[PDB]
Ligand binder design. Structure first.
Ligand SMILES: CC(=O)N[C@@H]1[C@H](O[C@H]2[C@H](O)[C@@H](NC(C)=O)[C@H](O[C@H]3[C@H](O)[C@@H](NC(C)=O)[C@@H](O)O[C@@H]3CO)O[C@@H]2CO)O[C@H](CO)[C@@H](O[C@@H]2O[C@H](CO)[C@@H](O)[C@H](O)[C@H]2NC(C)=O)[C@@H]1O
Ligand SMILES: [Mg+2]
Length: 300
């Protein structure tokens, strides 16, 4: 379309922390990473603007022109809410109507076709669901992704309750994207990400028993944290390749990672938003993950 492009059936849309001073134009990231799809992080509640803003403080409309330039090369975005630090819109809103108004403002500002709710903190899932019922009614072309904490012993944690609530309320669930990272008791590697995927598969089958195996895998995305994780385990380039190959084999819906600006070598084991604390060359993880899309027709 004019001001929105198709996202492939099997896509890779890594997270960009939009608040960083190092922020490049999205078109430049497309050239460097090899993907022209990104998840833009994060919209939070800003007290200053009394509504949505990047990192809860940066004007909502700041990146509109970057998104239109990305669309000129056929790229497209997913807009993410939430993340590791609040306050979330869904926490601050007094009513589902107010919450829906805020989500819709973000949709309309970016002509968004896909929203991602990266819900790490405790929330009122009922209030979220009621807002999303309004959103999907008023903006029926917009897909909803839910990006949630996960663990290889359980799959989704409290996030499972969020999906259960969405399903029962009749809120569309286009993507369930466990964050396969930061378990603390066991390392963030390919083996554990695959265990998470299998657990989430079983979880979604319980919610949606009428869906085929392939329908369930299509709903699933996986998001590791590249290189050093907050718990000091390391998701290596070898882990990345193994996970990509598993993901291709299982024809899952998507991959992403945290994060684009971390795809640079850095001092060993140091946690930073600007590098990944491993020695792999610039953009190495990006190029491996792009292979997931390439298997299914993508070329850039
Ligand atoms: C898309 C997604 O929301 N992205 C981010 C996600 O946040 C992780 C937290 O950072 C992490 N906390 C630290 C202390 O480890 C958290 O770990 C918990 C697990 O969720 C949890 N497991 C589940 C099953 O309950 C539990 O067992 O323990 C751990 C520890 O409490 O995990 C979440 C993901 O679930 O990951 C990135 C990277 O950390 C995070 O990025 C940070 O984002 C903030 C803004 O929110 C930026 O200011 C930071 O710069 C950025 N850090 C990195 C180094 O760039 C996203 O928010
Ligand atoms: Mg929110």
């Amino acid at each position: 379309g004019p001001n929105a492009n198709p996202i492939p059936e099997h896509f890779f849309a890594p997270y960009i922390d939009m608040s960083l001073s190092v922020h490049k134009p999205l078109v430049e990231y497309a050239k460097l990473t090899g993907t022209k799809y990104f998840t833009l992080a994060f919209i939070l509640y800003s007290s200053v603007y009394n509504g949505p803003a990047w990192a809860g403080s940066i004007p909502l409309e700041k990146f509109v022109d970057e998104v239109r330039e990305l669309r000129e090369i056929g790229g497209e975005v997913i807009i993410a809410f939430g993340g590791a630090v609040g306050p979330y819109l869904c926490q601050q809103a007094s009513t589902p109507e107010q919450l829906a108004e805020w989500y819709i403002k973000v949709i309309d500002t970016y002509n968004a076709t896909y929203l991602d709710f990266a819900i790490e903190a405790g929330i009122d899932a009922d209030k979220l669901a009621d807002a999303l019922l309004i959103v999907q009614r008023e903006r029926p072309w917009v897909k909803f992704s839910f990006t949630l904490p996960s663990d290889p012993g359980i799959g989704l944690a409290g996030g499972y309750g969020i999906i259960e609530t969405m399903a029962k309320k009749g809120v569309r669930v286009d993507r369930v994207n466990p964050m396969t990272m930061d378990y603390y008791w066991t390392p963030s590697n390919a083996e554990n990400a695959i265990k998470v995927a299998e657990n989430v598969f079983r979880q979604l089958k319980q919610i949606y028993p009428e869906k085929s195996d392939e329908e369930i895998w299509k709903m699933i995305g996986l998001t590791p944290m590249i290189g050093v994780n907050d718990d000091k385990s390391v998701f290596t380039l070898e882990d990345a390749q193994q996970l990509v190959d598993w993901a291709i084999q299982h024809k899952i819906g998507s991959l992403a990672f945290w994060s684009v600006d971390r795809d640079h070598p850095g001092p060993t084991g140091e946690v930073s938003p600007l590098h990944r604390g491993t020695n792999d060359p610039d953009w190495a993880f990006s190029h491996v993950f792009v292979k997931f899309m390439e298997a299914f027709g993508y070329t850039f």
